[PDB]
Design a protein around this ligand. Sequence first.
Ligand SMILES: *[C@@H]1O[C@H](CO)[C@@H](O[C@@H]2O[C@H](CO)[C@@H](O[C@@H]3O[C@H](CO[C@H]4O[C@H](CO)[C@@H](O)[C@H](O[C@H]5O[C@H](CO)[C@@H](O)[C@H](O)[C@@H]5O)[C@@H]4O)[C@@H](O)[C@H](O[C@H]4O[C@H](CO)[C@@H](O)[C@H](O)[C@@H]4O[C@H]4O[C@H](CO)[C@@H](O)[C@H](O)[C@@H]4O)[C@@H]3O)[C@H](O)[C@H]2NC(C)=O)[C@H](O)[C@H]1NC(C)=O
Ligand SMILES: *[C@@H]1O[C@H](CO)[C@@H](O[C@@H]2O[C@H](CO)[C@@H](O[C@@H]3O[C@H](CO[C@H]4O[C@H](CO)[C@@H](O)[C@H](O)[C@@H]4O)[C@@H](O)[C@H](O[C@H]4O[C@H](CO)[C@@H](O)[C@H](O)[C@@H]4O)[C@@H]3O)[C@H](O)[C@H]2NC(C)=O)[C@H](O)[C@H]1NC(C)=O
Ligand SMILES: *[C@@H]1O[C@H](CO)[C@@H](O[C@@H]2O[C@H](CO)[C@@H](O[C@@H]3O[C@H](CO)[C@@H](O)[C@H](O)[C@@H]3O)[C@H](O)[C@H]2NC(C)=O)[C@H](O)[C@H]1NC(C)=O
Ligand SMILES: *[C@@H]1O[C@H](CO)[C@@H](O[C@@H]2O[C@H](CO)[C@@H](O[C@@H]3O[C@H](CO)[C@@H](O)[C@H](O)[C@@H]3O)[C@H](O)[C@H]2NC(C)=O)[C@H](O)[C@H]1NC(C)=O
Ligand SMILES: *[C@@H]1O[C@H](CO)[C@@H](O[C@@H]2O[C@H](CO)[C@@H](O[C@@H]3O[C@H](CO)[C@@H](O)[C@H](O)[C@@H]3O)[C@H](O)[C@H]2NC(C)=O)[C@H](O)[C@H]1NC(C)=O
Ligand SMILES: *[C@@H]1O[C@H](CO)[C@@H](O[C@@H]2O[C@H](CO)[C@@H](O[C@@H]3O[C@H](CO)[C@@H](O)[C@H](O)[C@@H]3O)[C@H](O)[C@H]2NC(C)=O)[C@H](O)[C@H]1NC(C)=O
Ligand SMILES: *[C@@H]1O[C@H](CO)[C@@H](O[C@@H]2O[C@H](CO)[C@@H](O[C@@H]3O[C@H](CO)[C@@H](O)[C@H](O)[C@@H]3O)[C@H](O)[C@H]2NC(C)=O)[C@H](O)[C@H]1NC(C)=O
Ligand SMILES: *[C@@H]1O[C@H](CO)[C@@H](O[C@@H]2O[C@H](CO)[C@@H](O)[C@H](O)[C@H]2NC(C)=O)[C@H](O)[C@H]1NC(C)=O
Ligand SMILES: *[C@@H]1O[C@H](CO)[C@@H](O[C@@H]2O[C@H](CO)[C@@H](O)[C@H](O)[C@H]2NC(C)=O)[C@H](O)[C@H]1NC(C)=O
Ligand SMILES: *[C@@H]1O[C@H](CO)[C@@H](O[C@@H]2O[C@H](CO)[C@@H](O)[C@H](O)[C@H]2NC(C)=O)[C@H](O)[C@H]1NC(C)=O
Ligand SMILES: *[C@@H]1O[C@H](CO)[C@@H](O[C@@H]2O[C@H](CO)[C@@H](O)[C@H](O)[C@H]2NC(C)=O)[C@H](O)[C@H]1NC(C)=O
Ligand SMILES: *[C@@H]1O[C@H](CO)[C@@H](O[C@@H]2O[C@H](CO)[C@@H](O)[C@H](O)[C@H]2NC(C)=O)[C@H](O)[C@H]1NC(C)=O
Ligand SMILES: *[C@@H]1O[C@H](CO)[C@@H](O[C@@H]2O[C@H](CO)[C@@H](O)[C@H](O)[C@H]2NC(C)=O)[C@H](O)[C@H]1NC(C)=O
Ligand SMILES: *[C@@H]1O[C@H](CO)[C@@H](O[C@@H]2O[C@H](CO)[C@@H](O)[C@H](O)[C@H]2NC(C)=O)[C@H](O)[C@H]1NC(C)=O
Ligand SMILES: *[C@@H]1O[C@H](CO)[C@@H](O[C@@H]2O[C@H](CO)[C@@H](O)[C@H](O)[C@H]2NC(C)=O)[C@H](O)[C@H]1NC(C)=O
Ligand SMILES: *[C@@H]1O[C@H](CO)[C@@H](O)[C@H](O)[C@H]1NC(C)=O
Ligand SMILES: *[C@@H]1O[C@H](CO)[C@@H](O)[C@H](O)[C@H]1NC(C)=O
Ligand SMILES: *[C@@H]1O[C@H](CO)[C@@H](O)[C@H](O)[C@H]1NC(C)=O
Ligand SMILES: *[C@@H]1O[C@H](CO)[C@@H](O)[C@H](O)[C@H]1NC(C)=O
Ligand SMILES: *[C@@H]1O[C@H](CO)[C@@H](O)[C@H](O)[C@H]1NC(C)=O
Lengths: 450, 133, 133, 133
Amino acid sequence: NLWVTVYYGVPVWKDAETTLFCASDAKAYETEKHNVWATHACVPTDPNPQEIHLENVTEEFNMWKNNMVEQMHTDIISLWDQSLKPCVKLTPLCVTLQCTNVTNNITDDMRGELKNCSFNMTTELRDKKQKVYSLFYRLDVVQINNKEYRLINCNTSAITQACPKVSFEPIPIHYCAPAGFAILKCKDKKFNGTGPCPSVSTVQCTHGIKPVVSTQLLLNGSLAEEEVMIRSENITNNAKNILVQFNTPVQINCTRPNNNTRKSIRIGPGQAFYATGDIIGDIRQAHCNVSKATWNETLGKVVKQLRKHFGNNTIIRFANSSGGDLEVTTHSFNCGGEFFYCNTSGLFNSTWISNNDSITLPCRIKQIINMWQRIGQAMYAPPIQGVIRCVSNITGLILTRDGGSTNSTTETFRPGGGDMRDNWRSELYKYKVVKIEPLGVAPTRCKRRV
Amino acid sequence: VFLGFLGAAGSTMGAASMTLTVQARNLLSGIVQQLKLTVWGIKQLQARVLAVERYLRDQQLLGIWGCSGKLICCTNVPWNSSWSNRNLSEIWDNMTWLQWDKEISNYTQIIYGLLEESQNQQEKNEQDLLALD
Amino acid sequence: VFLGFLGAAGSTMGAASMTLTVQARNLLSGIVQQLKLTVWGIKQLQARVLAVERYLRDQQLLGIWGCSGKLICCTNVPWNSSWSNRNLSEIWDNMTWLQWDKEISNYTQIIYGLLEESQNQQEKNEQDLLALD
Amino acid sequence: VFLGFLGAAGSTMGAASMTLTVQARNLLSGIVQQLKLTVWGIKQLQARVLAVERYLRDQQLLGIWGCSGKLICCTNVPWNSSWSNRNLSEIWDNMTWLQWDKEISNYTQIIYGLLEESQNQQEKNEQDLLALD
Ligand SMILES: *[C@@H]1O[C@H](CO)[C@@H](O[C@@H]2O[C@H](CO)[C@@H](O[C@@H]3O[C@H](CO[C@H]4O[C@H](CO)[C@@H](O)[C@H](O[C@H]5O[C@H](CO)[C@@H](O)[C@H](O)[C@@H]5O)[C@@H]4O)[C@@H](O)[C@H](O[C@H]4O[C@H](CO)[C@@H](O)[C@H](O)[C@@H]4O[C@H]4O[C@H](CO)[C@@H](O)[C@H](O)[C@@H]4O)[C@@H]3O)[C@H](O)[C@H]2NC(C)=O)[C@H](O)[C@H]1NC(C)=O
Ligand SMILES: *[C@@H]1O[C@H](CO)[C@@H](O[C@@H]2O[C@H](CO)[C@@H](O[C@@H]3O[C@H](CO[C@H]4O[C@H](CO)[C@@H](O)[C@H](O)[C@@H]4O)[C@@H](O)[C@H](O[C@H]4O[C@H](CO)[C@@H](O)[C@H](O)[C@@H]4O)[C@@H]3O)[C@H](O)[C@H]2NC(C)=O)[C@H](O)[C@H]1NC(C)=O
Ligand SMILES: *[C@@H]1O[C@H](CO)[C@@H](O[C@@H]2O[C@H](CO)[C@@H](O[C@@H]3O[C@H](CO)[C@@H](O)[C@H](O)[C@@H]3O)[C@H](O)[C@H]2NC(C)=O)[C@H](O)[C@H]1NC(C)=O
Ligand SMILES: *[C@@H]1O[C@H](CO)[C@@H](O[C@@H]2O[C@H](CO)[C@@H](O[C@@H]3O[C@H](CO)[C@@H](O)[C@H](O)[C@@H]3O)[C@H](O)[C@H]2NC(C)=O)[C@H](O)[C@H]1NC(C)=O
Ligand SMILES: *[C@@H]1O[C@H](CO)[C@@H](O[C@@H]2O[C@H](CO)[C@@H](O[C@@H]3O[C@H](CO)[C@@H](O)[C@H](O)[C@@H]3O)[C@H](O)[C@H]2NC(C)=O)[C@H](O)[C@H]1NC(C)=O
Ligand SMILES: *[C@@H]1O[C@H](CO)[C@@H](O[C@@H]2O[C@H](CO)[C@@H](O[C@@H]3O[C@H](CO)[C@@H](O)[C@H](O)[C@@H]3O)[C@H](O)[C@H]2NC(C)=O)[C@H](O)[C@H]1NC(C)=O
Ligand SMILES: *[C@@H]1O[C@H](CO)[C@@H](O[C@@H]2O[C@H](CO)[C@@H](O[C@@H]3O[C@H](CO)[C@@H](O)[C@H](O)[C@@H]3O)[C@H](O)[C@H]2NC(C)=O)[C@H](O)[C@H]1NC(C)=O
Ligand SMILES: *[C@@H]1O[C@H](CO)[C@@H](O[C@@H]2O[C@H](CO)[C@@H](O)[C@H](O)[C@H]2NC(C)=O)[C@H](O)[C@H]1NC(C)=O
Ligand SMILES: *[C@@H]1O[C@H](CO)[C@@H](O[C@@H]2O[C@H](CO)[C@@H](O)[C@H](O)[C@H]2NC(C)=O)[C@H](O)[C@H]1NC(C)=O
Ligand SMILES: *[C@@H]1O[C@H](CO)[C@@H](O[C@@H]2O[C@H](CO)[C@@H](O)[C@H](O)[C@H]2NC(C)=O)[C@H](O)[C@H]1NC(C)=O
Ligand SMILES: *[C@@H]1O[C@H](CO)[C@@H](O[C@@H]2O[C@H](CO)[C@@H](O)[C@H](O)[C@H]2NC(C)=O)[C@H](O)[C@H]1NC(C)=O
Ligand SMILES: *[C@@H]1O[C@H](CO)[C@@H](O[C@@H]2O[C@H](CO)[C@@H](O)[C@H](O)[C@H]2NC(C)=O)[C@H](O)[C@H]1NC(C)=O
Ligand SMILES: *[C@@H]1O[C@H](CO)[C@@H](O[C@@H]2O[C@H](CO)[C@@H](O)[C@H](O)[C@H]2NC(C)=O)[C@H](O)[C@H]1NC(C)=O
Ligand SMILES: *[C@@H]1O[C@H](CO)[C@@H](O[C@@H]2O[C@H](CO)[C@@H](O)[C@H](O)[C@H]2NC(C)=O)[C@H](O)[C@H]1NC(C)=O
Ligand SMILES: *[C@@H]1O[C@H](CO)[C@@H](O[C@@H]2O[C@H](CO)[C@@H](O)[C@H](O)[C@H]2NC(C)=O)[C@H](O)[C@H]1NC(C)=O
Ligand SMILES: *[C@@H]1O[C@H](CO)[C@@H](O)[C@H](O)[C@H]1NC(C)=O
Ligand SMILES: *[C@@H]1O[C@H](CO)[C@@H](O)[C@H](O)[C@H]1NC(C)=O
Ligand SMILES: *[C@@H]1O[C@H](CO)[C@@H](O)[C@H](O)[C@H]1NC(C)=O
Ligand SMILES: *[C@@H]1O[C@H](CO)[C@@H](O)[C@H](O)[C@H]1NC(C)=O
Ligand SMILES: *[C@@H]1O[C@H](CO)[C@@H](O)[C@H](O)[C@H]1NC(C)=O
């Protein structure tokens, strides 16, 4: 008949949560506050990322109920933290600044975009003070009531200049699973985001995941295959976000074409602050180029795919975002060390019916960045010396709906968000952790009872 | 056949009935190697301790169901059919381990108790009986 | 009889001679689950490592006194009466484990050595002898 | 002969063939006992976990080469001579373990695989065959 049997080694898993540790490659050298990013304490990857495709398997995933994104998000916060524990605490900066304009080109093609501020400051000696001066981007200075100004995050947060040894260059991170667990990767080129993925594989641990911080635009991400997938748990809901993932890396060239000078001010003892000494070179405006042709064509591919969720009898409109906080209004990202806020009006400005040249994006440069919408904390990037030229793909999109009022053909979508955990779900959607239970009870003609 | 880690997941239970060791090896990962607080350091150690803890829980379970000669334990006592009674072909010609656990997920804690109590106690004290002559 | 954890503490040694497993199960507590420094965090982990360390010390001792088929090990060699010589009724009809350990507390390290050396070495190399024909 | 920990290092392999346990005991050091971050505290714990991890790796290996009745495992299948073929006197009358490992260091991962696969799978499912009559 059928009787009870015990096995050990039964390839069976459960959906579970557990902790996942980093796995990297040995390239830990940079020049802004510690290391490369945090990743030099990492265990070196196996030179053979062994995988195995699992025949016949069918497991439902839920890229919207996955937990790995949560661990990842907390850990990235904390690593940013640890990189910011040990370097200088810039509290005595929050001082009344005497600022004037920087007379940029007559009449105005930089509109200043930076003010020239002198101020009092402590010295090496807790004694007779010094008068220094520095150039600040008028986007991070605020008025009161020359005129007296101050740092923006000061009456709300403390600030913590990153010293010059870490990078911000994202380095491929490999989330690795401790023994007794397993990482499942959906091998299906065509996957909505959830539900049963038929073609799956197991890996000991994942691919390199460039942990780029970006808004409205997935940079350096992975690319989709044979289509440009759309992912969201409830498209019919207007309160989620649409995750578009391209086939073709649409280039973007961003640059800051200034030779900027690093002026060191000793907030003694021993602590030193890097201010913007001056700017030399072609004073253009920081910006980004994109091939208009490829963007238009690929966004038409997107038109097709958005249609496939709304009917071949519709008209879709891409508008720019509807205003608000800076960190959501723009394509914010990090690049060569600096922090870019690109206005994207020039990219969602078109309604679309049922059926070189290049686009220039004018971006501004911020300093006192408040990362992860967290308040009470504030990193202060240092003026990166030299000229910045930085090239990248844009592989995906993060859109928000406002329609379902007179909802027939004309839908309007605008970009936005502000939670990186979207960015993170865009590359872990194929991944799921399972706990292994190598203990098994099953019936065969081995026999025991109650 | 060298399937690999979980390599027989998409196979009938009798198929996986030969590739048991491959999962067992991965229960330490060897070289793993996985310095102050060091985010990912606490993670490393908490990981390793979790791993050995996990390992020892089940190895304990097997210690209790005293075999230690694992992958197979068999006695001569019949088995209760009440728990989702099914056919032999319904298992080996109709089911893989994955689908099987979905159905057996209820009776686990039950089975654990009697495999623990019954054979351990019966095989106990009989060795005590035969320690006389 | 289902006494429970230490349930046979107030019983003669032959009584507890049946409820051995119940203590053994509590050597991991399962779900225990027991975040920065987190007082009680270091405590949690230091606890778990202490537990498995404790477990492995004695499991090692049993590995050495090579049985692994625990709760009973028996050979055919006599026993030394010098160590607090007492009667059978003085043990099973007069003593519980608690009172017993108070009296045996002296000879432990002695006993450990010969159970370790003697049988291990004798049972060794005889298997080496019978590995010929 | 009571050599001690590694006491037979300077001896032919057949000599050390009797003092195996002495190293095994040192795999926990007992009392070790080895409070905030406390440099040497993290060291203590990371040490202990390393120790048990090390222990369990090889104990796992032995679990796989299913003996658990360690120090000797023997079957009736011949052995491959291709791997640095040498004489009996070339081993027991000419070599100590130290010199031996230098020569065998190449074939280890090979040997691990077949001792793992072959006997485990063959001795498997034959117990399944004799579980019928
Ligand atoms: C999406 O992903 C893509 C890749 O997939 C990313 O693209 C990366 O973008 C970054 C940002 O620019 C590039 O890194 C930086 O490139 C700088 C430009 O130098 C390059 O061009 C010059 C002139 O042609 C060459 O001479 C350079 O080659 C030499 O230098 C590099 C780096 O030192 C060496 O590796 C080579 O062997 C050559 O010796 C470059 O090809 C470059 O200045 C910069 O190097 C600084 O930064 C790194 C890390 O930040 C430091 O480790 C390094 O030591 C340098 O920093 C010190 O030196 C300068 C010298 O003046 C000082 O001023 C500094 O203060 C500091 O002391 C870095 O290489 C990167 O190359 C590029 N990827 C690839 C594959 O090319 C995108 O960034 C990413 N998306 C986003 C949004 O970022
Ligand atoms: C960001 O910025 C980078 C660098 O500025 C751009 O990368 C350049 O992209 C362009 C566009 O394709 C490349 O230009 C083309 O290169 C082809 C291959 O290069 C060979 O030929 C050139 C001569 O043109 C040689 O110098 C070189 O050594 C190679 O042997 C050429 O075949 C192309 O020429 C053809 O098209 C032009 C029309 O433009 C005709 O006039 C020509 O006669 C010919 O038919 C063209 O030169 C360029 O090579 C890339 N840079 C580099 C260093 O190679 C990114 O495109 C840019 N991204 C954005 C979004 O702006
Ligand atoms: C710090 O920097 C500020 C400007 O950035 C300096 O402020 C100046 O302070 C002096 C006093 O030391 C002020 O002089 C005062 O003038 C009034 C009217 O003339 C007079 O009645 C007072 O007796 C005094 O002399 C001066 O007006 C003021 N200037 C500004 C623009 O605010 C300050 O001196 C610097 N401190 C140090 C230690 O460097
Ligand atoms: C995804 O979000 C949409 C909303 O955009 C959800 O649809 C909404 O579902 C609720 C109930 O589930 C509906 O409430 C009631 O619906 C009935 C029938 O439509 C209606 O007669 C009632 O008056 C009441 O409105 C709601 O209308 C509906 N809205 C839309 C726009 O469809 C949908 O359920 C979400 N997805 C999932 C899987 O739940
Ligand atoms: C920001 O504004 C300050 C003024 O509040 C600028 O500082 C002053 O800039 C002038 C020229 O731009 C320097 O002039 C020099 O003065 C010396 C001594 O009087 C003279 O011998 C030289 O021939 C030359 O005329 C002056 O030194 C400088 N003062 C200080 C304290 O630095 C500053 O240049 C502005 N920032 C930028 C980036 O332009
Ligand atoms: C992002 O970039 C867009 C353009 O790509 C900026 O929108 C532009 O804003 C200006 C000022 O609001 C608009 O000028 C308007 O012109 C009319 C006609 O002369 C005048 O009557 C209005 O009073 C106003 O001055 C301009 O049309 C508009 N461009 C587009 C294409 O709509 C936008 O301000 C930028 N936002 C950020 C946050 O960078
Ligand atoms: C996205 O594109 C739209 C359309 O170009 C921009 O909206 C426009 O924004 C301008 C100001 O930036 C609005 O001008 C208005 O002027 C009146 C009179 O001075 C003032 O009282 C209002 O407060 C407002 O500033 C304009 O009405 C508005 N038009 C529409 C149709 O939205 C928007 O600024 C662009 N945003 C980005 C981030 O590109
Ligand atoms: C300094 O920069 C500001 C930035 O706008 C200039 O703005 C002036 O603001 C006042 C408001 O009280 C207006 O009346 C002026 O018309 C604005 N100026 C211009 C050119 O638009 C200000 O002019 C700049 N000052 C100098 C000396 O360049
Ligand atoms: C998820 O993928 C499925 C198909 O793989 C999409 O449609 C499903 O269609 C079946 C009918 O064959 C329904 O029973 C399912 O309920 C549908 N899925 C969902 C999630 O509702 C589906 O559209 C995809 N999900 C999204 C959000 O696009
Ligand atoms: C897309 O447009 C077509 C025709 O304009 C509609 O008709 C479908 O066409 C596809 C071809 O890709 C067929 O596979 C379907 O069977 C057709 N169905 C019907 C009902 O005609 C189609 O409905 C449109 N799709 C959407 C989502 O509106
Ligand atoms: C965005 O789309 C509009 C409409 O297609 C383009 O046309 C501009 O519309 C504004 C509206 O007031 C006019 O003021 C401009 O004069 C129009 N443009 C021109 C060249 O006349 C507009 O060009 C598009 N801009 C971008 C950046 O996409
Ligand atoms: C965008 O992603 C593409 C992925 O194709 C990157 O392309 C790589 O380009 C190098 C040199 O051109 C090739 O050696 C690689 O093989 C390409 N990748 C692949 C997967 O084939 C491209 O580098 C990315 N964009 C930028 C700016 O780096
Ligand atoms: C085989 O299993 C069945 C149930 O799966 C056992 O039935 C139990 O019988 C006892 C004694 O009357 C009841 O107290 C329980 O309530 C019954 N179980 C259930 C789920 O109701 C049956 O006893 C088992 N076989 C043997 C021989 O004990
Ligand atoms: C039984 O135990 C007694 C003591 O408990 C052993 O007596 C030992 O004999 C040796 C050899 O003469 C002495 O060196 C020891 O000093 C004695 N022990 C004590 C505590 O003094 C006796 O040897 C044991 N039985 C056997 C057969 O060895
Ligand atoms: C004994 O070992 C030798 C080598 O040490 C084995 O030779 C292998 O034979 C297979 C089958 O032809 C080849 O694929 C390998 O390349 C050979 N090994 C080497 C190192 O080249 C031999 O097979 C072993 N004995 C048995 C019975 O298998
Ligand atoms: C993009 O191309 C389509 C046709 O391929 C055209 O209808 C549309 O106008 C183009 N975009 C712009 C901004 O002109
Ligand atoms: C089980 O399957 C065999 C296959 O021949 C059949 O004879 C038998 O009746 C079946 N029994 C049950 C209970 O399904
Ligand atoms: C297991 O228990 C759940 C609890 O409701 C039940 O829904 C399911 O059908 C049970 N399955 C079996 C095979 O007993
Ligand atoms: C055990 O040793 C202690 C040490 O003095 C002694 O007092 C006690 O009486 C001894 N007990 C036995 C049973 O040998
Ligand atoms: C072991 O392999 C190394 C690798 O080159 C070789 O030099 C050595 O001679 C080999 N020894 C034996 C005994 O095979």
